[PDB]
Amino acid sequence: DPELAEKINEMLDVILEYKNEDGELIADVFQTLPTRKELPDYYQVISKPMDFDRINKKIETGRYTVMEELNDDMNLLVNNAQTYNEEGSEIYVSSETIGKLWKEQYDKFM
Amino acid sequence: GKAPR
């Protein structure tokens, strides 16, 4: 649905453009997971992988019909990072910031 | 930049 897609793209651009105090695009490490060949141990821990590459492919193929489906995928992205990575690590901290940014976008979409 | 447990 083009209207939903455009809303999604506007909300995700907020997250994808955000920089931390150090000038780093916090979302960059969540774009593309290491592959199953590169990092098999990730997949033994994480049963449902999610990244922004997968989210984009779903936008392009009509797999989002309602905003709650994207909310599920963003919660998956965040929760996987916090399952896999140690608390206080840069990647964990970045995931926490993504979670907060997403909830602001989702809460304002309503 | 992963930090596995």
Numbering used by the authors:
A (entry chain A): 4 to 113
B (entry chain B): 13 to 17
Give sentences from the paper.
To understand how SMARCA4 interacts with modified histones, we determined the crystal structure of the C. elegans SMARCA4 BD (residues 1176–1296) in complex with an H37–20K14ac modified peptide at 1.29 Å resolution. The CeSMARCA4 BD exhibits the canonical fold of a left-handed bundle of four α-helices (αZ, αA, αB, αC) linked by one long (ZA) and two short (AB and BC) interhelical loops. Residues H313–17 of the modified histone peptide could be unequivocally traced in the electron density map. The histone peptide lysine acetylamide binds within the central, largely hydrophobic cavity, as observed for other BDs, including the recently reported family VIII, yeast RSC ScSth1 BD–H3K14ac complex. The acetyl carbonyl group of H3K14ac forms hydrogen bonds with the conserved Asn1263 residue and a water molecule that bridges to the conserved Tyr1220 residue. Site-directed mutations of Tyr1220Ala or Asn1263Ala in the CeSMARCA4 BD independently abolish binding to H3 N-terminal tails in vitro, as confirmed by ITC. The H3P16 cyclic sidechain packs closely with the Tyr1262 benzene ring (Phe1571 in HsSMARCA4/2). The H3R17 sidechain is tethered to the BD αB-helix and BC loop via hydrogen bonds between the sidechain nitrogen atoms and the main-chain Gln1260, Thr1261, and Asn1263 carbonyl groups—all conserved in HsSMARCA4/2.
SMARCA4/BRG1 is an essential catalytic core subunit of the roughly two-megadalton Switch/Sucrose Nonfermenting (SWI/SNF) multiprotein complex, which uses the energy of ATP hydrolysis to remodel chromatin by perturbing interactions between histone core particles and DNA. SMARCA4 can remodel nucleosomal substrates by itself in vitro and is functionally and structurally conserved among eukaryotes. This remodeling enzyme possesses intrinsic ATPase and helicase activity and has a C-terminal BD motif capable of recognizing lysine 14 acetylation on histone H3 (H3K14ac). Bromodomains (BD) are conserved reader modules that bind acetylated lysine residues on histones. We use the reference nematode Caenorhabditis elegans and its SMARCA4 ortholog (SWSN-4 or CeSMARCA4)—which is conserved among eukaryotes and constitutes the only SWI/SNF ATPase in the worm—as a model.
